[model samples]
Target: ATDLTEMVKKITTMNRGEFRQITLKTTELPRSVIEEIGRHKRVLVLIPLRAAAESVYQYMRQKHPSIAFNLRIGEMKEGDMATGITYASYGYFCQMSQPKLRAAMVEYSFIFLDEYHCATPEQLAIMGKIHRFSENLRVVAMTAGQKHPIEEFIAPEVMKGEDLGSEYLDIAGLKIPVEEKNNMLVFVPTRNMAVEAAKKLKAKGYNSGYYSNLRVVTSQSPYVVVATNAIESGVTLPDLDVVVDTGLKCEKRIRLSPKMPFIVTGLKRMAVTIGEQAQRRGRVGRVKPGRYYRSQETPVGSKDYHYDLLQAQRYGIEDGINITKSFREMNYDWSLYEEDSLMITQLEILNNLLISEELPMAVKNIMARTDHPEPIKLAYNSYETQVPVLFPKIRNGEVTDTYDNYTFLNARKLGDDVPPYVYATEDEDLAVELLGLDWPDPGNQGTVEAGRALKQVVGLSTAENAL
Candidate 1:
């Protein structure tokens, strides 16, 4: 960790429109940020996850009760006239109305974008817009362990943290070498794997359960908690003595084409990135020095993936003055997406209305609280209870064996060319055998038939992949 006095001094001296970044120990960041806040700087801290935000918020409040701080989590009241400090998760901020966000941005002269390394493309876009909101707004981005170059920032050399003690574990099925004294946490790629792994650990005479976003089922002393990356960030398990990595995680990928720019190839269980591994390593050794174990010797991964700028648009008007100005300010890579894309056109039209102060019915839908405007509800009429029927596109009477075309029948209304696929069991392996695809799209688009019939395939789904 760098010297707090020196770091805070440097950060405090930054001017508006001057973006500076520094890498600090994750444990030291909250304190460093608090130091800046104590200096009487109106600050807005944007964190990636709620857990992380809560910890920072509480710590700040405890450290300085006199500082008027406001926290905005999901569905919290619109951040009215800003206070001394405001803490909000990136996703929660994404749901804020444009007028409210603009008003909030007007109050804060400085912004602390914490844990920037984990920021998604859209979040970056939002950050860019925030940058353009006012020239008097100074920005400082902070990251831990690994750092990605944000072209706009003048970044100091990244500080390296201590590597956790790690060893190769020959994990065979449910049987692990961990003892009852050490509280163990197992990370798997998917929910089903987590559930099954927890079940097997319990069967092997270990008190264990799974902890996932859907539902958390864990025990007290002498525990083995199998969890997904959903518990990855903003979580501290003091009893965690052993951290087991299955060496796989789910990630979003895109398969792009000239005609249809972005088609999200869907989430796939792939190798973990270097930053992700480092993050997992940081999870342990908080209270005491803990051990890290992995099943495979996979090479370190990189953040070579592209951002879904189109999805970023969902959070704010994409081509609006504030958004576009930030894009230029940040030197965002526009080659990844075309300037005159279809989605861009649609967004521009809507933005013009808002810019002209001509609020229409469509304005109600802008900056939606939910990712999906109209969520898809399941229709179990086609199959028995508890059984799901996935429909794959059929070309020339045979099932379209191309795995990407296979839409999990989680939706409705496809042409006659597509056939209904019913699986006898709820096994993932069978889904792979029955179709060339291995993973289901967690985006929950429901059915592709709505626009799959179109030649241009103009919509958010395709543009999300590219637009």
Candidate 2:
């Protein structure tokens, strides 16, 4: 690996308006970079995953206690505006409103776009307006390696060669007791699996934890944590000594139906990618050498799957149009829009709506925010009646007013509702299964009728609950 000392020094002296892209060899950032980073009074570090952002934020806070850092992911903190440094995810940045973004851009002296390759084009376009917000703001983009995605064959035998003093036992389709001294992470496909895996582990006399988007139940002793692909990137477990891969990933895909032009399906478990598996393997030996285990080897004749920006899951066309509209409102340029097939389709719809005068002026403005406006009003009214405009979180055998993640559902309601209030989870399988389907014939049912029906299905008392 080439020494980054010269590059770091060069970057430090670069002009304020200038930008540079640096490719690094290691996932962990260097000491010189951290030292150089703290020199700036106001800094913004944008990364791909919340886990990674938090990890780096925690690392910096722990080591450089003098530096002021703000973690921006779930909700805004009291001192967020006055913090010297801010760490946020690329996903969070893309959805931020233009007014708030402009304010942050003007305040920051330096902006570090980490894991730049994983960023969506819209995020890059928004960040491109830094000069307009503040002429003195310096920008730097960083990536671990090349820009394109790579594929590797996932197999269980690959783990057989590693030596970590003690080898991990592959408990694939078998019952086995986990060693109480070892700390392990078991990767599953869905939220239901994550919960179930932890339960099974605990049954065998080891302490187990389950981490998913909805809930996080932790175990400290013998520390076995079962998680979904949410843990694939950015999360660091220094005490982890073993990794168990079930070789599956849950992804949402779209289908073309006769009745509907576009239909998004439930998260389905499919074969894992080599690139993703490497991320899981990297979790092992974070602090010391550790072993890796896998449940199954990918079968022959299986399709080769890898990460592709064109086919990646993203916000809908309405979001793309609204986001672009918000950016252009400030007279900022946006020539870097991606023209993938899905994006092109979205653009076509936007172009048609711009020329068409079929709808009233009020409708058009509402259309800019979302495709459906009447349903949003209905949802508000239904929520007023406590019928849940969207799927309500069902936990501990009762329905709670809160939600795990419902970004698209919230987007239909409009406004800048991001994570913790919104991204877009399961039960304790029955709860997940119910939410995955449409809300029990929503078209004809009244709010009270719908409420009674939902309670019946979830095995709750309709009269006793006071709907």
Candidate 3:
């Protein structure tokens, strides 16, 4: 740990190069101070996600227009020994050609890698290459997470200070009493989920709307706002009263997982800081204590169930298990990946099971039923048997007749696909047989009602309903 007073003194006194050296040596300034330092230096910011990087860039450009700045977004690519850096802007994918990136190494003064913990080994190699090419080049890795690669691999001269913001308050545990509050920005995991949640909120008479990076317009109401991770980084909504995190699953490619149970320590730091800013929206008058509510979905089954999945996957699973387990232990029940604050548990279990056995052997009998045209054909045969029954019916003509009349009547409808079918009848019996169910009596009212309902809804005549 570095002394905060000494670090501040050093930062205040040093020139660009010396400032870089001091930051590389120390690890204890407030986030506000470090951000100020970055502003003072006018360093080029690099980040893993284009949206987040761009958000930071836009903020800097707007806040400090006098300071010249550049933004480079990096993504990992297989077989690539080095990461590429390029200038990017809104609405266009701006990338420097490989040769151009190599050429500009000596020209840039400093590089700021946000979310540095997420960088790949290949990206690290590229960073090394940049250092090798330019001696004056400096790089600072900034993140709220503790897993920064610079702390492990890069020397002090290259790595900068760890600055957790003093003003950056943590609101992880605070609870909100009411369902609706002014300036509340709820972060659901996906656009569709955000929209759905917003709709639910609105139906309950709360004003809410969904927003994403490329599509945030001003809203009419101040009661509630819904958005994806787009609300994670830039643009502070001052009136934001509460945040409802629907939770997010870890993707294999990104690999953000938590280790502890019931505590999403992975996204905790970032989420807390952002939530704090949101809380400030309600603190206008006498500064009443604001609240932040972090909603985490617990996983189904017991902790043992998750352990089974983890053990089965072992080294194959991404490091995101920590976050997923945390969510599960917190009692957040998530059916979909987008509903949880961590990676999807179901997919993890399936992946583990998949790696353990020979899939072909599992379906060998079914494969043998096919003509065995090729291994792919055998695989397809097995797949057809294993696939969900509704999939084929929906894809094929099984659901078509119920909606055929509407389709014929509205042939000019631009987006109409094949019409859908309502009653299963013969196919329903087949479905029951394939699914292995006991036979129902001939006069079951459930089937009869379903048939009649389908006929009426799709504009089918009574004669058609009988057929």
* Candidate number of the best TM-score: 1
* Model 3 C-alpha lDDT versus the unseen true structure: 0.35
TM-score of 2: 0.46
What are the Cα lDDT values of the candidates? 0.51, 0.48, 0.35
lDDT of 3 by residue, 56-90 (tens): 55766576555554554454222322222223321
- By lDDT, the best candidate is 1
- TM-score for each prediction? 0.57, 0.46, 0.32
Q: Which stretches of model 2 miss by more than 4 angstroms?
A: 13-18, 25-43, 47-109, 117-138, 144-185, 194-242, 255-265, 273-275, 283-291, 295-467
lDDT for each residue of candidate 2 in 1-467, tens digit (9 for 90 to 100): 25666777876676766666676632233334546766446667777678887988798778767667677777544334545567877656545454555666656656777765453543444453343453466677676622222222233442445443334333433222335277777888878878876776677666677773212333254577888888754455545667777777776432211111112233467777666766677676555666676655562232221112212212222222233233232223322222333333332232222222233344334434554322222222322222213445565576566644422334331112211210022231234344343212222223334334333433433254666
Report residue 35 deviation for candidate 2 (angstroms).
8.8
Error of 3 at 461 (Å): 64
Candidate 1 ranges beyond 4 A from true positions: 25-41, 50-55, 72-83, 91-106, 120-122, 133-135, 145-185, 196-226, 231-243, 259-261, 279-291, 299-310, 318-412, 415-467
For model 1 the local lDDT of residue 455 reads 27
lDDT of 1 by residue, 285-306 (tens): 6666666766543635554233
